[PDB]
Write a protein that binds this ligand. Sequence first.
Ligand code: SRM
Ligand code: SRM
Ligand code: SRM
Ligand code: SRM
Ligand code: SF4
Ligand code: SF4
Ligand code: SF4
Ligand code: SF4
Ligand code: SF4
Ligand code: SF4
Ligand code: SF4
Ligand code: SF4
Ligand SMILES: O=S([O-])[O-]
Ligand SMILES: O=S([O-])[O-]
Lengths: 363, 363, 417, 417
Amino acid sequence: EGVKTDFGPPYFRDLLHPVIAKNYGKWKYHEVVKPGVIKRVAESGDVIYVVRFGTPRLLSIYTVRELCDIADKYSDGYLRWTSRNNVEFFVTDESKIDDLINEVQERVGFPCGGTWDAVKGEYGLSNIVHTQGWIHCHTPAIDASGIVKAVMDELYEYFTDHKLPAMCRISLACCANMCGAVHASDIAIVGIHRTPPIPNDEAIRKTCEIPSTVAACPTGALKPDMKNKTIKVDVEKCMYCGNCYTMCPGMPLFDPENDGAAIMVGGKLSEARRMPELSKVVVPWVPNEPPRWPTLVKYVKQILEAWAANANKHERLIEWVDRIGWERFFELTGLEFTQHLIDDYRITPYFYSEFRASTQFKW
Amino acid sequence: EGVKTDFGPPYFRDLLHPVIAKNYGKWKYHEVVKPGVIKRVAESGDVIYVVRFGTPRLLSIYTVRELCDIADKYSDGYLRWTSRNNVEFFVTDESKIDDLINEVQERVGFPCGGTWDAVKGEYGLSNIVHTQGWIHCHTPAIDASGIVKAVMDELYEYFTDHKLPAMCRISLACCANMCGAVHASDIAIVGIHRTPPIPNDEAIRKTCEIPSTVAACPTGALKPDMKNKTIKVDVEKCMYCGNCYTMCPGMPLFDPENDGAAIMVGGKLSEARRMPELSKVVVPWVPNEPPRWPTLVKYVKQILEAWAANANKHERLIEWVDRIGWERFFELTGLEFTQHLIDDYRITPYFYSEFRASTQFKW
Amino acid sequence: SETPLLDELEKGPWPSFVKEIKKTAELMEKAAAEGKDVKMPKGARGLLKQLEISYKDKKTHWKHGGIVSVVGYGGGVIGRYSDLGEQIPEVEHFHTMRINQPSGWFYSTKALRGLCDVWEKWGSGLTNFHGSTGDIIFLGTRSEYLQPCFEDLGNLEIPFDIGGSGSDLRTPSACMGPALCEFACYDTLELCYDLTMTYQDELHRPMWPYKFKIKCAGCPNDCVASKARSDFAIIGTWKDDIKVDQEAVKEYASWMDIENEVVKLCPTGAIKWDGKELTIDNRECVRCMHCINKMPKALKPGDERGATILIGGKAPFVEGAVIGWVAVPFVEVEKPYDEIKEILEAIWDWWDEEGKFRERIGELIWRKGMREFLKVIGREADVRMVKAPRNNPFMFFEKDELKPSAYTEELKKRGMW
Amino acid sequence: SETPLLDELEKGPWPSFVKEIKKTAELMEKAAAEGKDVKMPKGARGLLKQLEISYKDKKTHWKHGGIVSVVGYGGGVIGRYSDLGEQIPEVEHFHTMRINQPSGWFYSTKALRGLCDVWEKWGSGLTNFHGSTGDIIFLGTRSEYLQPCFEDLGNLEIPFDIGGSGSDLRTPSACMGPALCEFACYDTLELCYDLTMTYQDELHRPMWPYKFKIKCAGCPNDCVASKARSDFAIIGTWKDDIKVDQEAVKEYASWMDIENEVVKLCPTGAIKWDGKELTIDNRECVRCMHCINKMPKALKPGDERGATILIGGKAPFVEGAVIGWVAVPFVEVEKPYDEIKEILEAIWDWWDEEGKFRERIGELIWRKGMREFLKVIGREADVRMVKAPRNNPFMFFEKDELKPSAYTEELKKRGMW
Ligand code: SRM
Ligand code: SRM
Ligand code: SRM
Ligand code: SRM
Ligand code: SF4
Ligand code: SF4
Ligand code: SF4
Ligand code: SF4
Ligand code: SF4
Ligand code: SF4
Ligand code: SF4
Ligand code: SF4
Ligand SMILES: O=S([O-])[O-]
Ligand SMILES: O=S([O-])[O-]
């Protein structure tokens, strides 16, 4: 026989609740009943309630098993995750929804919420997309899981209720690689370095393919040193992006006192009302201060609260800035503008600003 | 004693009309009476009329002498030119305005107009800013004067009346050095080449400084040839900009059959209603067809008329595009979008698009 | 406490990842103590110890890892090695296995219980539901367990294959689409599955200059963020009229400020409401979704459905982050999706031929130009691909576009044509 | 039929440049036949003949010309050589002289006539009124006549000096400003003259990496197009309230659709008209001028006046075409303009030291960054300098901004600091 390979993921259709399989592609409408609970009504007359809960993303297999027991009890053995790592159950008996919610809260401590209702125009804050941080990655500038927890503790009330006037995605990149749509989030927390690498010549000779490491530097701060079969850094050209360390173990640049997070704002993925946008730096640096990152958290909250106090219904952060301008943004958020915030990333072509980075166009 | 140097231009204040000189910086309001004539009212209550006339820019000294004869008669021996190379007379007797207009047309053949009235919202087409072409320049791809002549004969009635619903600047450059405000005009005509340079090895050895010529190519299509002491050109990288010829007489790229003009659209300099804008190519190439350039002229007129027929009052070309989109612009102007119009000029930094290229900001 | 910093993060209302790690450590240790077949019962506790140290030092303790894989594949598993591996040997090698999710993250409990049983046996017990691309992450195992874990995965009643990593086709992902969403313009789940199966070889055996990611969103709300984090974003759209139920609009109007919340928020002013009849000028509509999002009982996407393809989306390195741009304004999405496959295979053949080491497709297009890219996919330039035509006259022209001339003849004679 | 192609261009209502050239030859040759002191009578006809051949060939007949100047100066004269020099001897040499215009192109008839007399004596008789930078163009003379022509210009009752060319300070130009315009926020014409006078050496004797242009606009309408055609654009502005005459607003309101033509066109919604009172939220106003342009009898710029400085404007070569961007949000404009001169001279010292051969200031700033540029001029970064903060996290930090650390000590230890 030999080991089976190239068989791919189990086919999803087989893993759908029968009521979902039955009504697949034949939905009439959805209705957000209350935070965390969405009613979906099929053309057949079937009604199913999709009940959503926040999760820490990192799950114990034992928590997955508990979710399975809950799904067997309330959703006929079916569930899904969402694209922001919330978890959802499918309930056909409306009188059981609150029983499910209470059971999830009791058994795994996951809050019902993370929904929003465009129809009434009241929005929850959903989960923070994030990645590995110090839990698993060799290139982070900041932790991911710790910051997400510290932030969601402070903003918890916004997850469990529809208290915001528009969508607000908070997302976290533990380094400049992003590993997520962090560069297009309403509020993005992005791990940065502020110190150049110090080449380890022995490590570079042993392990680094020089031409490709040199070609990895967006500023051309690296040059080969043929004499010493290594690489030299022009520290005046380096902005500490860390890409050369991705390529080369001999180029580390981590400094625990100077690594930290930039806070960016005003990104957008959806098309609704306004084109998608890359996020923009408004706080150059906050230190890592584990376990609660109070400086970072204070700024995220300061930004979210200023936006929420002032935004109209549906007006996302970038849309609020579209309205008031950056001068007012910095005033109302209490943030200082400094020269760091003036873009100087030379290599990106202006012509990209002329491409249609959006599905919005007329036929 | 020798020769006097470093004395500068004559002091402007000494060359001012008494009414202008008297009421300097003490004006109440202007009023556009009719096309070509602008009433200016001082706080002192003094009234003067500035009367504007189209020139072919290139003037015979005998035309200037005649202008001086006209100026002595009607404007106290005073006149000015405008930043679009029109000429203006200063009349204090309103009954004598019409006479001056007739005598300018009879003597020098200059039309009255080139004005606009934002108050009522009726706009004339003013003069076309342009350069030297085959008259005096060694790097042109098109003539200037010939085309400007052809275009303005065709568009004449827009100069002498207020037939347009917003401001429209037409401008011309004979080569990509794009002398003038061509890169920020509502409609711009730019001379382009479509053939790469054929290096002249002898002329390069005698007359060119190789490293500075090589360094002037925006695409890096140029390289020193060592064992021939000359320049090599990689045709695949060349987009026929002609900068290398500017540097080096040994680098001509003129092909009478393939030189011609690109037509660009939607630049804006003023702040009013919306930020300044750089012009955009909408017609990649039209032939030189001296002396009337009928292909070029048809497209300029085609573009202008389509805009005029659809634009709201004050809605300049770029603003019209803001409203309808480029999809509808190409349909309405009857133009073809081709790959040529997708920007691929690599060297320009994206960060420029984030700089405030405008005086519009809040205090 | 052994973990005084991390213990701070068990406090507070949001569910604690610290609690998940400690629950795993506690119950893996218990399972092993009970005689269950558990290969790495100390893995989760090691991870906890490493993390506490990282909290105190404010830095990672992970280093570059070796290259590790399951037999027959070259992607899907990433070696990770701890620099604390002498002090905490249970995390010295702590690799991840990316496990291809079912389309839209739909599971039965039977499927998930199989995965739990396999990872309890071979790995730390920690998982991510889900990795950012969409895969399930099995977080932490040793090199010697990768192959046996994979054999068990393949032998489950509901088996699971490895997803992508490295310079390959990554695991495609899809929004819930028509399983639940009345907005879906094509079958996101079916397409995602069919692409995954079609290109198993490209996914499992990296052969390309760099990574390539595909994501499938059912409509322009883009609920999988395909345009920021896939190179090839397949985003549902329609070509005909928005469907309007007038009785339902009137019902909305009894309570909803349609003027301020819908009409004034339309990006192109396509949709109007006079108190009696809702009108949409679909020629003006850019299909942004907002009105349909506002009035889902009254408004629907049109009947002539397909997708727009956005190309290039990527994180920053090297030449800057990209929200992908219009490459294909409209393609039909009907099984077996030959049109989509044809485009993908053309792009891949070209990118493999022309691409530099670690050059993303978006960067290759920036380097070679849209003209070359479009010829590769056998499509014509379209105005919808740009937000604006170029702001400079520095255009390249094709040889066959030029007038015959003495110069063009000279160029031929000189050998430069 | 000497000039059949050019002849067609004497037809039509727009005043003909061919008629301008034909008149010049015909009167210059008349003068030299009448015994008037005229050195190049065949100047204009030769030009006409060349242009006719040019029209036939559809190409220029001018080539690269020698470096030719007046004594004591290095710029202001552009050498031009014809390649039909043997067939048409009269245009073998055909150099331009750029003559500095008075500020705002204001002339007395006496001043102009002096120019005519001198050029009739020494050149072709062809001029441009005006060359794009602002200068009067004397179009076509021989090398021998440059120095005597200039001598005569500086000997005139109202004397004219040479303007700029080459890698120098170009001739500054200015909008009419306070001479005629009620929108003027400063004395553009005085500023322009004072600058021209103060930097005579820098204009006359090119010593810089490349050219540098200054233009002076009295308010944001930018009527000399300073932001596109100057490296240093001085654009008038104000800091206080737009002055509002409610009486005059009602006069407009009686015939003007203020709602649609003013209120709805304000870029920031700052201006309100309810039918009785006009209100301007000056905090929201971006001083775009539209409302003031619209109701000039009613609306005036504020009394706290100065200028905004936009830096970097230029044509495309080499790095792309530039509309200048905010360098100094507000500077006072008062004689002797020490604050402005301080800025300019710091910019020049820096540019001269740091600029590459043929690098424009805009390209230098792009290369070196705004931090270095602002330090050079002694000003702080301001949010008003950008349309948006950067879209990526790749920030440089000053050494002294860093927290002292074992890492920074290591950098210092290695001399990498
Ligand atoms: C379940 C999920 C899809 C999935 O396959 O998992 C989903 C499901 C829905 N999305 Fe979404 N979206 C999901 C991620 C997203 C994301 C992707 C992301 O954040 O990474 C976005 C793009 C975010 C962005 O724009 O930056 C997204 C932007 C939207 C939009 C736009 C809102 C806006 O005003 O811009 C709508 C419209 C709306 O508000 O009803 C939307 C609307 C919906 C609707 C109402 C569609 C429908 O007809 O049912 C679904 C219920 C959402 C709700 O709570 O009201 N969905 N949706 C996603 C849940 C994430 C979570 O747990 O919170
Ligand atoms: C596991 C995952 C994060 C997570 O915790 O969920 C991940 C983790 C890593 N990413 Fe990623 N990326 C993950 C999705 C992404 C995404 C989002 C996506 O796929 O939807 C992106 C943005 C899109 C893109 O690829 O550009 C992303 C952009 C990167 C980058 C930058 C790419 C660029 O051109 O800038 C790197 C660096 C590189 O490619 O060398 C990278 C490299 C890495 C490395 C291999 C670290 C490195 O510096 O070499 C990560 C290993 C962590 C570890 O060993 O545990 N990862 N990475 C995500 C994949 C799991 C899965 O299969 O579901
Ligand atoms: C005469 C001249 C000044 C000078 O010679 O020093 C001038 C004079 C005035 N301009 Fe201008 N502008 C002059 C060049 C310009 C040009 C600059 C250029 O084309 O190189 C434009 C900028 C072009 C652009 O925006 O791309 C210009 C931008 C304006 C704006 C246009 C507002 C808009 O709709 O965008 C105002 C506002 C207005 O319409 O009243 C304006 C208005 C004015 C006013 C009304 C100011 C006033 O209070 O009197 C002056 C009368 C013009 C008129 O006909 O209504 N002037 N003005 C200019 C010579 C041009 C000509 O002969 O036609
Ligand atoms: C004299 C003038 C003719 C005209 O009517 O346009 C002129 C004509 C020439 N320009 Fe210019 N420029 C003239 C104003 C401009 C302007 C507009 C302005 O100054 O207001 C620009 C755009 C602003 C700028 O400088 O960027 C302009 C941008 C250029 C270019 C492009 C520089 C760049 O960075 O891209 C070259 C510079 C070069 O060749 O090195 C140039 C160079 C030249 C040369 C010397 C040709 C060359 O490539 O060597 C010109 C000689 C023509 C001749 O011999 O008859 N000229 N040129 C213009 C000014 C007359 C005057 O003194 O008043
Ligand atoms: S964003 Fe950076 S630190 Fe976080 S997982 Fe990706 S590569 Fe690692
Ligand atoms: S950290 Fe980034 S900028 Fe600095 S040398 Fe490495 S790759 Fe280059
Ligand atoms: S635009 Fe070009 S061809 Fe025209 S005058 Fe300037 S340098 Fe010469
Ligand atoms: S014409 Fe332009 S692109 Fe071509 S070699 Fe010369 S300078 Fe380079
Ligand atoms: S992208 Fe569209 S089809 Fe898919 S879940 Fe979101 S709203 Fe529904
Ligand atoms: S989908 Fe968007 S663009 Fe179309 S009518 Fe609705 S709100 Fe307007
Ligand atoms: S720039 Fe302003 S001050 Fe100068 S003429 Fe134009 S409107 Fe008047
Ligand atoms: S100047 Fe412009 S921004 Fe200010 S109130 Fe008037 S129209 Fe509005
Ligand atoms: O693992 S990352 O490259 O998607
Ligand atoms: O002559 S150009 O440099 O203005």
